Each structure stands twice: as C-alpha cells, then as structure tokens.
Amino acid sequence: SVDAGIGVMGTKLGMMSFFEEDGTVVPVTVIGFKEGNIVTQVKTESTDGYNAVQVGYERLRDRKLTMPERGHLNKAGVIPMRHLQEFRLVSVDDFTPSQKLLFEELFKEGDMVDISGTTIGKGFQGGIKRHNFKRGLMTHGSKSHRALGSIGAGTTPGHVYKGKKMPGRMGGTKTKIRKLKIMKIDTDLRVVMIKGAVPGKPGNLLRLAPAKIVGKNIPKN
Amino acid sequence: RKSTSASTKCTEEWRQLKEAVKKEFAIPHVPLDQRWMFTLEEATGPDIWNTTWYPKSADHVPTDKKWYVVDATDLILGRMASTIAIHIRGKNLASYTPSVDMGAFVIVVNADKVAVSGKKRTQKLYRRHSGRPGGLKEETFDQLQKRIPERIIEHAVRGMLPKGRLGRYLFNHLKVYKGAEHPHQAQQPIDLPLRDKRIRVEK
Amino acid sequence: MIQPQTHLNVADNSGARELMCIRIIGASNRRYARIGDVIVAVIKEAIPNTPLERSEVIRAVVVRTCKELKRDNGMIIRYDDNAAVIIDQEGNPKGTRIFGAIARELRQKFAKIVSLAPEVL
Amino acid sequence: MKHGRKIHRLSRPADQRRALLRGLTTQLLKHGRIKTTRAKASAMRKYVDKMITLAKEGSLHKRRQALGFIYEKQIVHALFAEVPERYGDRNGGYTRIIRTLPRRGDNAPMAYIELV
Amino acid sequence: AVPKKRTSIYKKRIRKNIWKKKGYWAALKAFSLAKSLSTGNSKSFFVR
RNA sequence: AGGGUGAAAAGAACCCCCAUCGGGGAGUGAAAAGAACAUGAAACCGUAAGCUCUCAAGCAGUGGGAGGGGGACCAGACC
RNA sequence: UCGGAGAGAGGCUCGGUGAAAUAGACAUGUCUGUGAAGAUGCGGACUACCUGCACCUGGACAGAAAGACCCUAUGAAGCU
RNA sequence: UUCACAUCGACGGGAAGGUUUGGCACCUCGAUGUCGGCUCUUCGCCACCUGGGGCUGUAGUAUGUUCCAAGGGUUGGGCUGUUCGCCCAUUAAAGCGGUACGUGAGCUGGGUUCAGAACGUCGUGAGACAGUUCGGUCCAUAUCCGGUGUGGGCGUUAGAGCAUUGAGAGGACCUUUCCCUAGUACGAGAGGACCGGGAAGGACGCACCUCUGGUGUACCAGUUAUCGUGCCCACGGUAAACGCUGGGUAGCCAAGUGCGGAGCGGAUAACUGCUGAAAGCAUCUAAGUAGUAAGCCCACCCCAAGAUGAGUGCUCUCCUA
RNA sequence: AGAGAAGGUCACGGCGAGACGAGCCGUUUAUCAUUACGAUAGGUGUCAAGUGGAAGUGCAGUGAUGUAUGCAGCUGAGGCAUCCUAACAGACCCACAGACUUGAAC
Ligand SMILES: [Mg+2]
Ligand SMILES: [Mg+2]
Ligand SMILES: [Mg+2]
Ligand SMILES: [Mg+2]
Ligand SMILES: [Mg+2]
Ligand SMILES: [Mg+2]
Ligand SMILES: [Mg+2]
Ligand SMILES: [Mg+2]
Ligand SMILES: [Mg+2]
Ligand SMILES: [Mg+2]
Ligand SMILES: [Mg+2]
Ligand SMILES: [Mg+2]
Ligand SMILES: [Mg+2]
Ligand SMILES: [Mg+2]
Ligand SMILES: [Mg+2]
Ligand SMILES: [Mg+2]
Ligand SMILES: [Mg+2]
Ligand SMILES: [Mg+2]
Ligand SMILES: [Mg+2]
Ligand SMILES: [Mg+2]
Ligand SMILES: [Mg+2]
Ligand SMILES: [Mg+2]
Ligand SMILES: [Mg+2]
Ligand SMILES: [Mg+2]
Ligand SMILES: [Mg+2]
Ligand SMILES: [Mg+2]
Ligand SMILES: [Mg+2]
Ligand SMILES: [Mg+2]
Ligand SMILES: [Mg+2]
Ligand SMILES: [Mg+2]
Ligand SMILES: [Mg+2]
Ligand SMILES: [Mg+2]
Ligand SMILES: [Mg+2]
Ligand SMILES: [Mg+2]
Ligand SMILES: [Mg+2]
Ligand SMILES: [Mg+2]
Ligand SMILES: [Mg+2]
Ligand SMILES: [Mg+2]
Ligand SMILES: [Mg+2]
Ligand SMILES: [Mg+2]
Ligand SMILES: [Mg+2]
Ligand SMILES: [Mg+2]
Ligand SMILES: [Mg+2]
Ligand SMILES: [Mg+2]
Ligand SMILES: [Mg+2]
Ligand SMILES: [Mg+2]
Ligand SMILES: [Mg+2]
Ligand SMILES: [Mg+2]
Ligand SMILES: [Mg+2]
Ligand SMILES: [Mg+2]
Ligand SMILES: [Mg+2]
Ligand SMILES: [Mg+2]
Ligand SMILES: [Mg+2]
Ligand SMILES: [Mg+2]
Ligand SMILES: [Mg+2]
Ligand SMILES: [Mg+2]
Ligand SMILES: [Mg+2]
Ligand SMILES: [Mg+2]
Ligand SMILES: [Mg+2]
Ligand SMILES: [Mg+2]
Ligand SMILES: [Mg+2]
Ligand SMILES: [Mg+2]
Ligand SMILES: [Mg+2]
Ligand SMILES: [Mg+2]
Ligand SMILES: [Mg+2]
Ligand SMILES: [Mg+2]
Ligand SMILES: [Mg+2]
Ligand SMILES: [Mg+2]
Ligand SMILES: [Mg+2]
Ligand SMILES: [Mg+2]
Ligand SMILES: [Mg+2]
Ligand SMILES: [Mg+2]
Ligand SMILES: [Mg+2]
Ligand SMILES: [Mg+2]
Ligand SMILES: [Mg+2]
Ligand SMILES: [Mg+2]
Ligand SMILES: [Mg+2]
Ligand SMILES: [Mg+2]
Ligand SMILES: [Mg+2]
Ligand SMILES: [Mg+2]
Ligand SMILES: [Mg+2]
Ligand SMILES: [Mg+2]
Ligand SMILES: [Mg+2]
Ligand SMILES: [Mg+2]
Ligand SMILES: [Mg+2]
Ligand SMILES: [Mg+2]
Ligand SMILES: [Mg+2]
Ligand SMILES: [Mg+2]
Ligand SMILES: [Mg+2]
Ligand SMILES: [Mg+2]
Ligand SMILES: [Mg+2]
Ligand SMILES: [Mg+2]
Ligand SMILES: [Mg+2]
Ligand SMILES: [Mg+2]
Ligand SMILES: [Mg+2]
Ligand SMILES: [Mg+2]
Ligand SMILES: [Mg+2]
Ligand SMILES: [Mg+2]
Ligand SMILES: [Mg+2]
Ligand SMILES: [Mg+2]
Ligand SMILES: [Mg+2]
Ligand SMILES: [Mg+2]
Ligand SMILES: [Mg+2]
Ligand SMILES: [Mg+2]
Ligand SMILES: [Mg+2]
C-alpha cells in the first residue's frame, strides 16, 4: 500500500454545521492538531528494503515514555512523542529527521483527503447488528426471533464453512474513509474542517493523507 | 541469574566428574572414512558386525554435511528434482538409513531459468485451496515464474521427499535462490553430480 | 414515506377522493415514495358521476408527505397528510385545478403542477 | 452497550436504588462513618455531597429539598446547624473512602466511608 | 447435548490444573496485600 | 442394609496446637492393632524421583533404536 | 416494511454449596477416493504451535426404548 | 418468394446427465423419518439480465439464433398442503438445478390422514376409504469435530519497547433511467443509433450524530387515588421491572448525514487480425506477433512473520562480590 | 549467592476499551517567563443544554385561580477551571555478552 504524499495526524474534535454564502449547510468534522507531526525517521530502499517516513505526533512528558523509545527520539533530536506512524512513499529525498510538517502547506482548499482512524467499539455483537441479518418472525408460533438461523447445509458437507458469518466483536478497528473534501482551514486555531464523518468519537487519533486514486497517484501495479 | 553459590558450583563440578568417568570407559567413536573393520577397543564391545549397522549421533551431526549447488539454467524441472531428492534424502551414501538424515544440503540457483518441455509453460497448473468453499486458486506455471519463481522448484522437490516428520525436516535442507548468486560461499559448496542423460536440454 | 397499501388524499379536481398506493416507479427497487415520485395507485373512494370510477389503476405524483423534505438551506417541510395528484404519462395532471401547498422541489419534472398551485413552498 | 452512561446501578432497579441511597446517607449523617460495600460507597459519594452543598446555603428552599431526601428530620436540622461551621472552607470533597478486608460470607469487597 | 464419550484421564487433569492456576494469582494478590499491611503506612487501607 | 481393635480395655494420665472435633509427643501393648481400629486386590484420587512432549494427524501398538537414566555379575547382558 | 432504544429475571465475573442424561478405549482436521454402495480412524494430496474462555449449532448415521408405520409368530387381547 | 442447413426440421439413428415418473432391495430399523414457508448459506451451468462477439430472411430501433462468460443480480402482492400453476403492478431481468423438504440437539405449517365427531360410499355387521370435513403435546445445560471472536503458555538461540515488509487470507470491484454527442448517421417516410463524455437513482458496503427524529426507569413539568412527614403549606412513598401522561441532554440508533465502487495496469476465453510456410496458390498458425470481455491476476480496503520458511529496521539493557 | 537490568505483570483511579482476560489512559498532581507537553475519576465553581416560570412573601379576586419579585427554580451522563477526596502502601517475574562449525577480514 504505497501512499501518495505525506500525511499528517490529527485529533477529532467533533462535528458542527458550516454555511456557505448561498445557504448550503454542510456538516463538517473539525480536526484539531497538537504539537507534533515531526518527521522522526527515514527509511531508504537500500537500508530498509523500501521508502518510507516515520512521523511522530502527540507530544508527551518524558517520564511516561519508555527508555527504548526515548532513545529512539534522541537519535532524531526531537521532542518526546506518543504516537509514531509511517507513510510509504515512492520517493523520499525531501525529508530529513527532525524536519517539521505543516498541514497548511500540504493541504489547500477543495483538496481530496483520506481519513484513516480507529472506529467506535460496539463490543460483542449479535448476528443482526454485525451482519444485517433479517430477523425471523416475532409472533406466530415462532421461537427464533434474533437467532442466527441455520448455519450450514445437511449431512454433506457436514461441518460449517470457514468464515461463515457469526456473532463476534464489532468495531474498534483501523478504517479508511476515502475521498473527503476540505471545507475550510483556520490558521488562527490551527484546525481543519472536513465535509462529512470521520471514524471514532472526539479525542480520537486520525491519520490524513492525500487520497490515493488507483489510476493516477499510484504505481500502476 | 546464574548463582555462584557453593551449591550450584558443587553440582556442575560433580556433573563434569560423572561426564568424565562416562567418557573414559565408553567406546570411542571412529568416523566412517577408510575406517577399517575394527579397533581393538570395539572388539570388547557389543556386536556390530553380525547385526545391521545403524548410525549413531556422532555421524549425522549437521555441521559435517556436504553442500551442493545446482545451476538450474537449461535443466529440466522434474529430472533435476529427482536427483536433488536423492541427494537430500541420502540415498547415494553407503551409510543410508531411512530413519535418519544422512543427506546433503542442496543449493539451487538461477531458479527462473529452469526449463520445461512441451506446452507446459502455459498449461501446467499450480493450484492451492483456501479452505473455504470456492476457495480454489489456479496459476499457470508462467504467472508463477514471473511472480515468485522459487516456489516452482520448492514445490517440485517437496513432492519427491518423504512426507511426515523426517520429510519436512528434510525439506529445510533445500535452499533456493532466483539469482545466479547465493550467500553460502562459506559452506564451500561442491557441484552436484548428474548421471542422467536427458537432464540437459538444448535448443 | 408512502408505500404499498398506504392511503392518500387527492389534491385536485380529477374526481377521486382517495387513493391506495400499490407501487413505486422509476425508483428501481426502492420501497419509499417521497415527494416527487410517480406511484401507481388505485382509486378507493371517488366523487360520484365523474370520469373516474373506483377500482381504477392510475398514475400519480406525490406532492405531500408526513415525512420531512430537506432542502439545502437546511430548510425542512412537514405536512399533516399524505397527498398525490393524478396524472398522465406525459407529466400533465388529468384534473385541471389543484389544492393545497406544494414545493419548488417539483418544478423540475412537473411544470403544470407547480403552475396550478395556490401556494408554493 | 453503555458509552458514557454514568450512574451507579448497585444491581438494583430504579426505585430500590434510590431508596437505598437515601437510606445510606441518613446513616452516614447520623453516625459520621460507616462500613459498606465498595460499590455502595462509591455510588453514595454524589448524594452525600449533594446534601452537604445543600446545607451550605441554608435557604428555606434548600432545607425543604434536603428534608425531601433524607428520611429523618432531626439529622437534617443538625446538618444545617453543623455544616457552615465544620465545612465552611472546604470546597467540595466531603467524604473519605477507606477500604478493608473483604467480607467472609460472599467475599464482597468492603469499605469504610467517612464523613471528612 | 451430551458427552458422546467420557473424558480421558490426562485431558481432565489439564483442565482442572487450569482451574487451579487461578489460586496462584490470588496467592500473589494475597502476598502483596499482606506486605502492604505489614508496614502500617497505608492510609487507604484499614484493619481492626 | 449394617459381622471380625486386642489375649486382656490394659480404650491412651500428663504436656503442646487447642472454642470442640482432630492432631503431635509421652504412657499401655508382642505389635498403634488407636476406636471410621484385623488380611486389605482393582477401579478411582493423588505425592515424590528417573527419561520425555508445545510444526503436530494418531484403535496408540509393534519390528528397527538415536540420545539419556538405572540396579548388575557371566559386566557384549538385563531394566 | 425494518428494525430501534430502555427496565427487570437470567446469561457473564468473584466467593459459598454443588447435580444430571451420557460414556468400548479414545493421541478425536479438510477435500477427494475407497469401502456393507454418505469414514477423524483405510488411500492420496492439502491444511494444521500448545491450551483456555464466550458464543453458534453443520457433523459425530448426537442423546432420551422396541418402530407408532410394513411384515413375521399356527403370538396376546377387544369387538362383530 | 429463388434457396435443405437465417429460422424450422418430418422418417430414423448416436449420445451425455442423474433434476421427473419408475425397476432393484445393497442400505438403516431402537429414537438413520416425506412437501411449503422463515433464517442462513454454499456450489453447478443446460445464460433470465448485466460484459464481449459470429450469422441473419441484420437499413435503423428492436429481434432471432449461436459462441465465450457463473463476477453480480434475480421485486412486492391476490391465490394454493402442495411440486406444478394462474393472475395484479412493476422490473435491466423477475434463470434452471445440486446441497438428506439443503437447513426439526435453529424456527414453523401441513404430512406418518393416532385416539373425538360428521358426511358420501362399501360392508348384514364390527368397521373400512391413497374420499372429504372440524379438533387435535416434541423434548434439549454443547463432550469432541466444525465455526465467529477473544486470551494465556511456549517458541522465534541473550532479554526487551516501538515501527513496519507481505507469503497467505478475506471484503469490495454491482446496476438503472435521464441529458450532451445528434433529431446526426440509417431510411421514401414513420422512426432513430454505435463509440465516447455528463448528471441524477437503485441495491449493497464502510463509517457517523451537525441537522430531522426514536428511545433515553440520568433529569424537568402536569396530574388522579392514597398513606406518611403533628396540622395548612410544601415535599416523600405506593399504584410491579416509570401510577398515568407531556418534554428531553449525553449515549445507542435510522427513516437522518457523509463516503465508496478507481485503472491507455498485466495475461487470457470466444472473435477480429498482420506478416507467412507445410501443400511455388491460398491460409489469423505451424515460427513470430496485434487488438479485445462485468471473467482471471495485480492495484483498492481490513487482517496478517505460529509465514516454525517464526522476516527487516531503530533504540534500550545486561549490575555486585 | 546478594541484589533487583531494560521491560513486564500486579496493586491503585479510571474510560468514547470491555462478557472475562485483553486495549488504552492515568498514579502527586509541575514549573513557566513567549505557545502546547503535569487534572485519571469524583466533588465544588462556572458555561453549553433541558425543562418552562421555583419556594416564600406580596398584591387582585367571594373563591377556584391569576399576577409581580424572576430566562425564575430544579437538573446539568456534556465542556472549561480548581488538588477538596481517592490515585496511599507497595508486591512479584526478570540481568551464562549470548552453545557448536566454517569462511572473510586484521
Ligand atoms: Mg465500546
Ligand atoms: Mg423479514
Ligand atoms: Mg417469543
Ligand atoms: Mg372490481
Ligand atoms: Mg386566484
Ligand atoms: Mg414504583
Ligand atoms: Mg418495587
Ligand atoms: Mg452534579
Ligand atoms: Mg493423644
Ligand atoms: Mg464457642
Ligand atoms: Mg483429642
Ligand atoms: Mg509412644
Ligand atoms: Mg512398650
Ligand atoms: Mg484393615
Ligand atoms: Mg510446517
Ligand atoms: Mg518439536
Ligand atoms: Mg502427534
Ligand atoms: Mg436491543
Ligand atoms: Mg436489557
Ligand atoms: Mg432467581
Ligand atoms: Mg462459582
Ligand atoms: Mg451417575
Ligand atoms: Mg490432536
Ligand atoms: Mg463404491
Ligand atoms: Mg467418502
Ligand atoms: Mg484420512
Ligand atoms: Mg492409523
Ligand atoms: Mg451440532
Ligand atoms: Mg442454541
Ligand atoms: Mg466428517
Ligand atoms: Mg465413529
Ligand atoms: Mg405359520
Ligand atoms: Mg392362535
Ligand atoms: Mg447437418
Ligand atoms: Mg438386506
Ligand atoms: Mg439417535
Ligand atoms: Mg455456457
Ligand atoms: Mg450479452
Ligand atoms: Mg448477438
Ligand atoms: Mg429490419
Ligand atoms: Mg454470472
Ligand atoms: Mg458465484
Ligand atoms: Mg446466481
Ligand atoms: Mg413472486
Ligand atoms: Mg422497464
Ligand atoms: Mg438494458
Ligand atoms: Mg438453491
Ligand atoms: Mg426449501
Ligand atoms: Mg439438524
Ligand atoms: Mg390437519
Ligand atoms: Mg348399509
Ligand atoms: Mg373405494
Ligand atoms: Mg379449538
Ligand atoms: Mg467445550
Ligand atoms: Mg473448537
Ligand atoms: Mg489462539
Ligand atoms: Mg498468542
Ligand atoms: Mg523467549
Ligand atoms: Mg516470549
Ligand atoms: Mg506505546
Ligand atoms: Mg501494516
Ligand atoms: Mg499479496
Ligand atoms: Mg496459515
Ligand atoms: Mg484478493
Ligand atoms: Mg476494477
Ligand atoms: Mg438526417
Ligand atoms: Mg455511455
Ligand atoms: Mg452511484
Ligand atoms: Mg442526532
Ligand atoms: Mg449531540
Ligand atoms: Mg419521548
Ligand atoms: Mg437523543
Ligand atoms: Mg398523619
Ligand atoms: Mg396528607
Ligand atoms: Mg410523588
Ligand atoms: Mg408505603
Ligand atoms: Mg398490590
Ligand atoms: Mg406497567
Ligand atoms: Mg415519558
Ligand atoms: Mg446513506
Ligand atoms: Mg490489456
Ligand atoms: Mg492474444
Ligand atoms: Mg477471420
Ligand atoms: Mg505466399
Ligand atoms: Mg493474409
Ligand atoms: Mg504460434
Ligand atoms: Mg476487465
Ligand atoms: Mg465498471
Ligand atoms: Mg518476529
Ligand atoms: Mg529453523
Ligand atoms: Mg535464515
Ligand atoms: Mg526493574
Ligand atoms: Mg484497573
Ligand atoms: Mg494486563
Ligand atoms: Mg505510588
Ligand atoms: Mg474532574
Ligand atoms: Mg472528567
Ligand atoms: Mg411563585
Ligand atoms: Mg414541583
Ligand atoms: Mg383576597
Ligand atoms: Mg435555557
Ligand atoms: Mg493546578
Ligand atoms: Mg490525598
Ligand atoms: Mg558471537
Ligand atoms: Mg567455540
């Protein structure tokens, strides 16, 4: 999954409504930022086998960090940071450890982004909620209701299939949301407003990249 | 933490004593190289002449094994893989035993240049199955050889090795590389003998 | 949110008092008539001695819902009843004069119908 | 699930849980310290404090509010008497919770809630 | 649903050992707790 | 349905743990045989010591036996 | 349609007490072939670290004994 | 019309399948049981629609027939115990089969017409009926396999914390109307395009709570009966697990809001092709190569080194006697 | 053998994480003086928000009731402040410079 362009990380602050001059109301997510988005490490095809750049995000007290990690960020000469992440480019010449990213440079207005985040955990969920199973009859004689159904065929094959859909734990995962739009950037509050919903509740941690378009931003294969 | 308390000290000391006395009285190992019928010591031992010889642990020790290299360029897949299997299994040593690994290591290089007769390049079919229904996947030989060409020879030799514990443990002695180069130069590989006539194809 | 078996008030002269929707058209397999969709209804109750007999299959466009229409102003509209207007396959209303309010959301596909309106919303 | 449902259920239905909490507070304000189960204590914090904050203002209105919570009048009047004196400078935080050895019968974790 | 067979001596011995391992973690909590109350410095804890 | 402490109750004083039961000494006794007491098989429940299992497919054994351990006197054997 | 949320009693965890039907022995994969003609156990391939827990019920021709249906018996009884 | 082979194809023949009605009695009789719906799959291709083609008695639109193609789709009702089938209104189309009626230790109707009763009919009669009719009990705490999730142990050759490569595995790559092209080709007219652009929809998937709401036994307000707080006032309890109503934040949720389905990437099936021999002619094929499919494979989206083949990268730590 | 490496588990305060384990965040709560990083939960103060005009005392009315004081009163699962309470006391696991061979370098 080679990624087009450097991304940045941010924090979901919650959603509000935002007008346009002509009275079109757009619901927008407001994505805040914190001190960070500092290039931590750079990986050369020679050295690592591939081309990538590790940006750290959330700053932090030095105590809370572990000695291996602190010693990772003193090799860089950067401030202590909670979350590290990698972006995979096809060319890294522009980047030095300790270099800083600004989201005002990378993202203009009306540009397309891709928001990766972690989803709301809904816990252990039934067949209905998890796979949209139609529920069986509520009344005439029927004892089933929200139950799973039959789970397989008869004597043959005589075992349930792999991956046959069943109740299990739902949510709480890395999820991409493709091709969103950027409505407004506030330099004052350093915030980015985005049309639509992004995963997870406020206080979340997001990763925004310039949108991969399978024809035109990416290696053909 | 390794205790240097007099207790553990004492224990290791004693154990080296036991090991000493057990090494003194036991029969010496005489490796099989121009090894004559018997040493004046074995002659006091158990009967190894009128019973079938079976290898002891000093023999098959992994460090000793021959290494071999097959240039797979213009070789024919199957006919080569047989020879490879023979040598890996050990079937060419007088000391062969089914229950043990007496075999070699084999290094196969230039694994994309391997040659195959007939229309096979476009026909022979490597299938593997997920384990879900409709989990079947098929490759033509050639898609495979463009994508990860080592799998071809690995998969052709694995077929001719025994199956089961000694089989799998054997298969780890087959070291395959797509390039003309291998990083084993330290092991000093000899070249692999081929007594087969038809094994070498010419165009 | 008109769906099959729903009853509807007729908004024009055409001589039906009430419709029962049996289908939704052009929406492919959607089950919801919302404002400005063509539904196939039948006539339950009629106004006597009029060109329209009860138990007729006819086309109508849905002009009023109890569900809520959202324009882009963030503006929202909710009526107190369901109503549709009986039409041709040409987009022209069979009956010639319409009651009640309508919306500017119908101006695109139906000119006639927005023309005859006593009020526009 | 519950996301951000914050209430203490105490494994009882609404009515009972209310009455239980009222009871436990008239107990704490009568005796000044008591022994309960960890959950009951933690749940009871809020209502203890509601009562104290109530008494700090002293209005007839507030006094009728407290009267309609605590069961025993006498404890209420004494509350409105003592509190300005004892707690006047304390902004919040009127209760200490000190845990103990668990119970013998069920091994339910115990606790000591103190009026501090 | 019933047990078509009877459970083999050794497998049962493993399942019951698992259930006995919980005693081990409770023994660690117990030990740590005694070593706490044995310095008399805890104001969060009380014993009579 | 529920029999067999010992020849004799000599049925265990005294101290210790100690709310009782139960126990450990001492004392009785040829023997503790200690009262749920005589020989006390198997299932079944364990504890300790020797070898050994976490890439594995198997009516569980058998023929071959790597490596490790044990009691020997025909130490080339047996377990 | 087309499901949604909530309250109780269970379910779940911890402490106390503590069953049952079942059970040749079980070190108990999938496909396909074979076979008393639908195999964890036979063959060939394929896939599989060891072991819990919560859930689900496709298999084990799952479990609860004579098959009510059909036939047999020079059986049994009731009735005409 | 001429013309057997566009489309039919009589008289006959040669097959495959194992879905109909059957023959057999190898099978199980103890508690291995038939047809429809619900839920939930899955696979076949003899293709109903969607993708590409050849032929036409193909002007165009629309067909007909056939080739490759099973990735995706295949509605809602009135009627039946039903397989079958009929109709209503749609629709791109409303495919046919297999899986023990696929699915009864998942659910439910009939069926094994069990015992009551009645009708027709047969029988002197008790009773009978591959006649009809009304009524009529199936249980279940999952041992193992199989599955969906979620841990521990141990391995990964000193011990760790981070960050990742991606073998393998999955999810999703769907489809309809309308508008430009152009009332242009085509046709005497009536009709009316291929190709390539653009919008709106459907179904499905992934998220979400700003709006519109649902609930919201956290709360707020009215209000009946009644018993408490000495009595008025004002509050408290009860009217199961809200006494009854009217509102509701946070949450969860859809009918609400966003987003998604991209590929002048690779290789093929049918087919159309170029150079061109064996047969000094010809021929898409034998050498070699060109286009080209909703198919196949990469790319997209999650997972993923128990990938024991246990990967690479950065950093940290190994004291004292 | 003493000690307790890096780290882990536990304990303790929690959650937009959760059946349990797991996950994640905290654990003396800074200093500042020019950024951010040292408030986890509860309480308290204030704010968004909800409900819809408290009680008491006045006036009007024969009275039920209305009206003023007053965007009142209650609530505030959400934000922001503030260490007032509880994050006390602590415990356990854990530290053979990494067997053996061969080349290359020096
Ligand atoms: Mg959650
Ligand atoms: Mg349904
Ligand atoms: Mg029910
Ligand atoms: Mg009629
Ligand atoms: Mg007028
Ligand atoms: Mg009540
Ligand atoms: Mg009650
Ligand atoms: Mg509060
Ligand atoms: Mg005694
Ligand atoms: Mg006593
Ligand atoms: Mg005693
Ligand atoms: Mg004695
Ligand atoms: Mg004596
Ligand atoms: Mg005895
Ligand atoms: Mg393996
Ligand atoms: Mg092993
Ligand atoms: Mg095994
Ligand atoms: Mg629910
Ligand atoms: Mg509930
Ligand atoms: Mg009960
Ligand atoms: Mg229990
Ligand atoms: Mg029993
Ligand atoms: Mg096994
Ligand atoms: Mg057969
Ligand atoms: Mg079979
Ligand atoms: Mg088998
Ligand atoms: Mg076997
Ligand atoms: Mg089952
Ligand atoms: Mg069940
Ligand atoms: Mg099976
Ligand atoms: Mg069996
Ligand atoms: Mg006879
Ligand atoms: Mg007879
Ligand atoms: Mg012919
Ligand atoms: Mg027979
Ligand atoms: Mg059975
Ligand atoms: Mg076909
Ligand atoms: Mg077609
Ligand atoms: Mg055609
Ligand atoms: Mg024509
Ligand atoms: Mg298809
Ligand atoms: Mg398919
Ligand atoms: Mg299909
Ligand atoms: Mg239908
Ligand atoms: Mg149509
Ligand atoms: Mg079409
Ligand atoms: Mg089917
Ligand atoms: Mg069916
Ligand atoms: Mg079943
Ligand atoms: Mg019936
Ligand atoms: Mg008669
Ligand atoms: Mg008859
Ligand atoms: Mg009845
Ligand atoms: Mg189990
Ligand atoms: Mg399992
Ligand atoms: Mg696991
Ligand atoms: Mg694990
Ligand atoms: Mg390790
Ligand atoms: Mg480890
Ligand atoms: Mg971290
Ligand atoms: Mg990754
Ligand atoms: Mg891949
Ligand atoms: Mg695997
Ligand atoms: Mg794939
Ligand atoms: Mg595609
Ligand atoms: Mg023209
Ligand atoms: Mg087009
Ligand atoms: Mg679309
Ligand atoms: Mg909302
Ligand atoms: Mg909100
Ligand atoms: Mg409501
Ligand atoms: Mg709400
Ligand atoms: Mg009274
Ligand atoms: Mg009263
Ligand atoms: Mg009341
Ligand atoms: Mg009462
Ligand atoms: Mg009552
Ligand atoms: Mg009620
Ligand atoms: Mg209400
Ligand atoms: Mg939507
Ligand atoms: Mg191509
Ligand atoms: Mg081609
Ligand atoms: Mg041609
Ligand atoms: Mg020529
Ligand atoms: Mg030509
Ligand atoms: Mg060719
Ligand atoms: Mg394609
Ligand atoms: Mg497409
Ligand atoms: Mg690793
Ligand atoms: Mg290895
Ligand atoms: Mg290696
Ligand atoms: Mg340490
Ligand atoms: Mg905790
Ligand atoms: Mg943990
Ligand atoms: Mg501490
Ligand atoms: Mg706080
Ligand atoms: Mg807080
Ligand atoms: Mg007032
Ligand atoms: Mg009130
Ligand atoms: Mg007056
Ligand atoms: Mg307000
Ligand atoms: Mg401060
Ligand atoms: Mg303190
Ligand atoms: Mg070394
Ligand atoms: Mg050495």
From Swiss-Prot, chain A:
Q: Per the annotation, which location comes first and is thus the protein's main one?
A: plastid
Q: Where in the cell is it found?
A: Plastid, Chloroplast
- So which domain of life are we looking at? Eukaryota
One GO term under biological process is: translation
Under Gene Ontology molecular function, one entry of this record is: rRNA binding
Keywords linked to the UniProt accession: Chloroplast, Plastid, Ribonucleoprotein, Ribosomal protein, RNA-binding, rRNA-binding, Transit peptide
Task: Fill in the subunit field for this protein.
Answer: Component of the chloroplast large ribosomal subunit (LSU). Mature 70S chloroplast ribosomes of higher plants consist of a small (30S) and a large (50S) subunit. The 30S small subunit contains 1 molecule of ribosomal RNA (16S rRNA) and 24 different proteins. The 50S large subunit contains 3 rRNA molecules (23S, 5S and 4.5S rRNA) and 33 different proteins.
Q: What is this protein called?
A: Large ribosomal subunit protein uL3c
Primary gene name: RPL3
Full protein segment contained here: 85 to 305 of 305
Swiss-Prot record, chain B:
Q: Where in the cell is it found?
A: Plastid, Chloroplast
GO MF annotations in UniProt = mRNA binding; structural constituent of ribosome
- GO-annotated biological processes: negative regulation of translation; translation
**Signal sequence residues:** none
Q: What is its main location?
A: plastid
* A single GO cellular-component term on record: cytosolic large ribosomal subunit
Q: Which UniProt keywords apply?
A: Chloroplast, Plastid, Ribonucleoprotein, Ribosomal protein, Transit peptide
**Self-association state and partner proteins as the record states:** Component of the chloroplast large ribosomal subunit (LSU). Mature 70S chloroplast ribosomes of higher plants consist of a small (30S) and a large (50S) subunit. The 30S small subunit contains 1 molecule of ribosomal RNA (16S rRNA) and 24 different proteins. The 50S large subunit contains 3 rRNA molecules (23S, 5S and 4.5S rRNA) and 33 different proteins.
**What does the function comment of this entry state?**
Component of the chloroplast ribosome (chloro-ribosome), a dedicated translation machinery responsible for the synthesis of chloroplast genome-encoded proteins, including proteins of the transcription and translation machinery and components of the photosynthetic apparatus.
Family the UniProt entry places it in:
Belongs to the universal ribosomal protein uL13 family.
**Protein name, UniProt field:** Large ribosomal subunit protein uL13c
What gene name is listed for this protein? RPL13
UniProtKB/Swiss-Prot annotation, chain C:
A Pfam entry, by short name: Ribosomal_L14
Q: Which CDD domains match?
A: Ribosomal_uL14
Enumerate the subcellular locations listed in this protein's record, separating them with semicolons.
Answer: Plastid, Chloroplast
Presence of the UniProt keyword Zinc-finger in the record: no
Q: GO MF terms on file?
A: large ribosomal subunit rRNA binding; structural constituent of ribosome
Residue stretches in coiled coil: none
Which GO annotations describe the biological process of this protein?
translation
Q: Which UniProt keywords apply?
A: Chloroplast, Plastid, Ribonucleoprotein, Ribosomal protein, RNA-binding, rRNA-binding
Q: Which domain of life is it from?
A: Eukaryota
May I have one GO cellular component term?
cytosolic large ribosomal subunit
Q: Which Gene3D superfamilies match?
A: Ribosomal protein L14
Cross-referenced NCBIfam families: rplN_bact
**Function statement:** Component of the chloroplast ribosome (chloro-ribosome), a dedicated translation machinery responsible for the synthesis of chloroplast genome-encoded proteins, including proteins of the transcription and translation machinery and components of the photosynthetic apparatus.
Q: Report the sequence similarity comment from the record.
A: Belongs to the universal ribosomal protein uL14 family.
Quaternary organization = Component of the chloroplast large ribosomal subunit (LSU). Mature 70S chloroplast ribosomes of higher plants consist of a small (30S) and a large (50S) subunit. The 30S small subunit contains 1 molecule of ribosomal RNA (16S rRNA) and 24 different proteins. The 50S large subunit contains 3 rRNA molecules (23S, 5S and 4.5S rRNA) and 33 different proteins.
Q: What is this protein called?
A: Large ribosomal subunit protein uL14c
Lineage of producing organism = Eukaryota, Viridiplantae, Streptophyta, Embryophyta, Tracheophyta
From Swiss-Prot, chain E:
Record carries keyword Transcription: no
Q: Which GO terms describe its biological process?
A: translation
Q: Which UniProt keywords apply?
A: Chloroplast, Plastid, Ribonucleoprotein, Ribosomal protein
A GO molecular-function term, please? Answer: structural constituent of ribosome
| Regions crossing the membrane | none
Localization recorded for this chain is: Plastid, Chloroplast
**GO CC entries:** chloroplast; large ribosomal subunit
Could you say which protein family the record assigns here? Belongs to the bacterial ribosomal protein bL32 family.
Task: Give the function comment from the record.
Answer: Component of the chloroplast ribosome (chloro-ribosome), a dedicated translation machinery responsible for the synthesis of chloroplast genome-encoded proteins, including proteins of the transcription and translation machinery and components of the photosynthetic apparatus.
What does the record note on quaternary structure? Answer: Component of the chloroplast large ribosomal subunit (LSU). Mature 70S chloroplast ribosomes of higher plants consist of a small (30S) and a large (50S) subunit. The 30S small subunit contains 1 molecule of ribosomal RNA (16S rRNA) and 24 different proteins. The 50S large subunit contains 3 rRNA molecules (23S, 5S and 4.5S rRNA) and 33 different proteins.
User: Mind telling me what this protein is named?
Assistant: Large ribosomal subunit protein bL32c
Origin organism of this chain? Spinacia oleracea (Spinach)
